[PDB]
Design a protein around this ligand. Sequence first.
Ligand SMILES: N[C@@H](CCC(=O)O)C(=O)O
Ligand SMILES: N[C@H](CCC(=O)O)C(=O)O
Lengths: 267, 267
Amino acid sequence: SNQEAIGLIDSGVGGLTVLKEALKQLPNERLIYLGDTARCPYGPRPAEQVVQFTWEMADFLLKKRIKMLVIACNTATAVALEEIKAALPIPVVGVILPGARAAVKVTKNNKIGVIGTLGTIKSASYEIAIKSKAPAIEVTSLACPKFVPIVESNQYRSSVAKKIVAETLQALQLKGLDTLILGCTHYPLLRPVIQNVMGSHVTLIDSGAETVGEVSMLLDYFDIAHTPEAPTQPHEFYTTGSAKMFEEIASSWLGIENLKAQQIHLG
Amino acid sequence: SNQEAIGLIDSGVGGLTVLKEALKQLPNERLIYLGDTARCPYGPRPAEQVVQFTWEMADFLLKKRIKMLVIACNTATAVALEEIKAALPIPVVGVILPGARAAVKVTKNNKIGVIGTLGTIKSASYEIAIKSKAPAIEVTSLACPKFVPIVESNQYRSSVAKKIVAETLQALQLKGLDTLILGCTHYPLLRPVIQNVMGSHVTLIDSGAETVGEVSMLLDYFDIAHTPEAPTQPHEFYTTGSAKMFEEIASSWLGIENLKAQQIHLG
Ligand SMILES: N[C@@H](CCC(=O)O)C(=O)O
Ligand SMILES: N[C@H](CCC(=O)O)C(=O)O
């Protein structure tokens, strides 16, 4: 039971921003990742469809007997999370609130910004979360549909990427924000470009990175932590797309040479 | 449910450091504090008797419809958390693990120190928590019985307090540790002196503060956080000993003026 793995789902490589942090904070925890690279991008897809696809990724991992489910995707979290948490016996973790509480703790301006997919922005989740914590804070949300493709295409270091991020982020310019929430688990791979565009006066919040911290206490809370020894079975990486392009960017961002990945089918 | 208070039970006035921390981190949360001042200290008492008392406090608070139970006492937590956590229908939190988690996270040389009451240290609760997370860490546990009286008599600023603290903490001086957990509700008031004695290489963990950060994450997890929105009632303070003397220590620490407390009978 406790030696069972922790499963992480996402639409593609975004989930890896959370996974990377889990390797660093929870070294003795076995992980099983699933990225629906085939149906990506979610962020615009209709909520109902996203709820569907997400459940599909869940069922795929449930058959592998995971002890905890981490929806390392803002889009999925925003629409799916309550429903899947209520339905499953194991604990389910989303990435919105951890990012929201971290932003609230770091802002000195009370002027916070958040960027994410269409779906995340439309759900007004981050607005709704921040309001319930500190209503005096002014939140400015912005959808950035062009970002995710830049990451999936493994061109998040390109000059092209820099120009897109720049023009897209100009809409948040001159609004006095001192904190910007990376409301998409894909955005941390663009962090250096985003930090450069926003300036050194703006603190970036990595939503998924903050989530691992919550994961850590939940393991103790539900007393289902893995024994303090590096797992026997290695970490499993699945993708519904080119298992090869996955390994390409996965191994680079994670720093894992010869990172294995296996393509699969859903729905 | 969401509008109901959070309950904190403690041996006496110590737990007020945890309650004060909650007033800071959770301003919208209604609190209900219970302190068995008529029977403290708990540290020098045998575990069983402590388990019995803790249960009485818990019961009394449950009858008052709290949504979450916080065992602010390390001594109490070290022996009664498991049972009470398992028995109650509401979330039950203790102050040991949040601190061990934080310590393990910050140590760079694998040498964590821990101080508290004879009871706390005698239960080996911290050594157990830390080694089940990271076996490679050498845990040094020391009981410091003079610290509580030193704090309860409002003598924690005196140059005298520094000599005593320096003398008691001499043992830990030759271990080479870089992390020391303040495993007792009283110790936060001695933090400045303890810090100077332990030096700039040592990071002090405030179990009270780490615990409140968990309650915050747990409020969001179970989605039972009190609305930011309106409206709240007075915090409630209960004690098994003199309410007058308590109302003194309360305003003398929480700062709050006219804090009214009620004396009650448990068993
Ligand atoms: N992983 C992205 C989803 C991007 C997409 O599928 O469009 C998120 O954090 O919401
Ligand atoms: N509250 C106790 C100290 C006071 C007592 O001895 O009862 C603790 O934190 O261990």
